Design an enzyme around this catalytic site. Sequence first.
Site, mmCIF file in Angstrom:
data_model
loop_
_atom_site.group_PDB
_atom_site.id
_atom_site.type_symbol
_atom_site.label_atom_id
_atom_site.label_comp_id
_atom_site.label_asym_id
_atom_site.label_seq_id
_atom_site.Cartn_x
_atom_site.Cartn_y
_atom_site.Cartn_z
ATOM 1 N N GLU A 94 25.611 -65.227 26.594
ATOM 2 C CA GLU A 94 24.440 -65.829 27.217
ATOM 3 C C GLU A 94 23.995 -67.084 26.473
ATOM 4 O O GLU A 94 23.524 -68.043 27.095
ATOM 5 C CB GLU A 94 23.311 -64.801 27.284
ATOM 6 C CG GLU A 94 22.519 -64.815 28.587
ATOM 7 C CD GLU A 94 23.404 -64.915 29.819
ATOM 8 O OE1 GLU A 94 23.090 -65.742 30.707
ATOM 9 O OE2 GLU A 94 24.404 -64.167 29.905
ATOM 10 N N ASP A 141 32.747 -67.343 27.757
ATOM 11 C CA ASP A 141 33.571 -66.445 26.953
ATOM 12 C C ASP A 141 34.323 -67.207 25.873
ATOM 13 O O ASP A 141 34.461 -66.723 24.744
ATOM 14 C CB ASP A 141 34.555 -65.687 27.842
ATOM 15 C CG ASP A 141 33.911 -64.515 28.550
ATOM 16 O OD1 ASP A 141 32.805 -64.108 28.131
ATOM 17 O OD2 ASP A 141 34.514 -63.996 29.515
HETATM 18 ZN ZN ZN Z 1 28.087 -65.187 32.237
#
Ligand code: ZN
Lengths: 418, 406
Positions: A94, A141
């Site tokens: 996040e 990611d």
């Molecule tokens: Zn996400």
Amino acid sequence: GSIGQEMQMGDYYVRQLRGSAPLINDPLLTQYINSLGMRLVSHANSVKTPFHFFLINNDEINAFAFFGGNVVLHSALFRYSDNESQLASVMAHEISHVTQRHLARAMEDTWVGALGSILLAMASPQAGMISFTQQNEQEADRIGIQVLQRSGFDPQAMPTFLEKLLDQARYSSRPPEILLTHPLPESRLADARNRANQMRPMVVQSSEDFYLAKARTLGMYNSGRNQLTSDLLDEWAKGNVRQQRAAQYGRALQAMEANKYDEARKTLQPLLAAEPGNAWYLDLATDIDLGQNKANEAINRLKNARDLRTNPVLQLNLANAYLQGGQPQEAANILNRYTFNNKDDSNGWDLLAQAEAALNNRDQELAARAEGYALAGRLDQAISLLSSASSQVKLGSLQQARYDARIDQLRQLQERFK
Amino acid sequence: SIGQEMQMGDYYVRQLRGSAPLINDPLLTQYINSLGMRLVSHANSVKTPFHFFLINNDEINAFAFFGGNVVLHSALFRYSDNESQLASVMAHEISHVTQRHLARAMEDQTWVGALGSILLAMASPQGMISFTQQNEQEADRIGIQVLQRSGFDPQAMPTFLEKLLDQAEILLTHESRLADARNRANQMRPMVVQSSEDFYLAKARTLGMYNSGRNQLTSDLLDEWAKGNVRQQRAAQYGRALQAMEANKYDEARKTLQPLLAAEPGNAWYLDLATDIDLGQNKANEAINRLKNARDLRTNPVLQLNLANAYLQGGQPQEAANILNRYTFNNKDDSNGWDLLAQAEAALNNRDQELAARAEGYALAGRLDQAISLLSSASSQVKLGSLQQARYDARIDQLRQLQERF
Ligand SMILES: [Zn+2]
Ligand SMILES: [Zn+2]
């Protein structure tokens, strides 16, 4: 200024969050989540704004973030997180959405309220909904795993956590709400597993604060699927000794929740004897003490604390102890300095309101609860309280000038947004 | 041959006695080896005599070397919940010796002393050796049978290994191998398990009398033992009497032991502590008479040293010598007998006999030159041509041959 607009746009949504979503305002849990989050931010690239990390009482797993470095985490994250590095991977994920300005760049294509309504629907247990491109999720990611690693967490935790989300996306009729804001195709996973395989093997141990945070979240703020199960408590009784102290801490909480105070006091004793200076059991040690109207004992223990000058958890715990003990002035001496050092902490203002009310300082009581209403987005109501405060002090006094000045500031916040 | 290795084994043992903190307690060493001995006899690939040593170290570790000499750290008792778990460590460690793994490993490549310095570093609380994945995959599964023919829990090994994992020292010298330990234990059989009466008291004296760091006999365990089977309740009462004696609470020690001694007047453990309580209160005569009426007095080494020591404190050094003179020829390697015999010969003013007894103590501790010096002094106080001179000079000859090998 974009960063200026984003920071106050974020403040507007954070204030709407406080006023209608069920946030966990517990000192221990908010301090931990932000300490863990800031440790990730401090290792992130191109951070241009402060960061705050919020906790929702929601048993549906989700996580999201918006302008101003504000990230929202549901309490269900502690139910799915087996280790601290898994929870960190979600916050790293996040955090990278913010640093990449994904939500900001997606919105350049009534609209301020349209997004705010979406934000609270995702946070409230009453669920439009935002979604990121799978390209966006790859950058989150890719960047999140590197922040995860420079912060000393297990990089394999990110793919390991993603796979546990996938095993509930087909072994359960309900797609967990996190997978709809953050979609998880197998490419996303295989890309994540590959990156982790190419970093250094690292076996990391979850901090002792993590298990205690997990215990307090599920034990004290239990809700729906967010329970502190006896199966997990007995499982923690066999694991490493960090999980056993956490398992002892969890049953002391539930013994206190059921008003079995002497049962809880006697369970908490051995952990306090080993660690007489850590805030976690100190916090509940006062909680059980005041449950039996032994406020002096709670006060004496907290005045003997080493880090009372540095730990807000200790400072609020003693201020509350002074209030229940019948010395509101000693509580006010702490809280006047506390609220000035933590102006966004509504726990501090609410306690100051209690102290000023017990001292019959009504104008100062109204001003203290005015700040609670301002933090909750209730600016019309905050202005009403300060109007009443200003009507109880002589005109030309500074109290009047200060109360009227604060009303002026809240009116500016008000006109910036409709 | 076995000859060099048995002699290499004796050399490493002597070095351990001189520098490592060995527990020389009669009751504990008698139990440590009695359990080892009938455990030894259930393996058939053994070339050597076996001796088992206990080291006062709160860091858990276990190792062995040439001559069937195994080393067990006292921390093993707090990790061992039952007798079989304790023998599981020993069965694993004796299986290393019988199959000659450590000798195998050093045939590949100053060396003998380098290994001895390492052996002390592992043993001493204040460089290490490490085994390959096969090597102990041998030892554990070869050792689980050796444990089963001796009548102990085969599942006692696996529960010990898992109790090692969640705490991450024995783990440097010793999931795949662990998964095989639980892999291999479940297949054989499930076994009735009952610790000996001596295991519970031995664990009580180790943790109670030789407490050090993490090796404490806690108030949680003996409260628990008072709720167990009747063996653990007698052991819990023994441990509380032992700690009262350790804290010099002599009257409380006598009244705590009184019901145990009344029920088992011939028990060597209680007879031993009853002597410590009696001597601690300057009541040596009472301790002597009690020991003369013990059934196994001239057959049990623990009782003989206890009575010999009581004769010394009681002002009867001759009677102490009559026991110890025979004890030291039946237990040549027992430094306690040699030390007590030196105290008796000092009290009788038999100087050359005192120097001779002191010399054996120094020889067992690996200080051969000093032992040769003391025997040289003894031989100078005795007439040339006397039988004593011939013995002293012969023993010097034997010690000089020992030091010329290494
Ligand atoms: Zn996400
Ligand atoms: Zn081994």
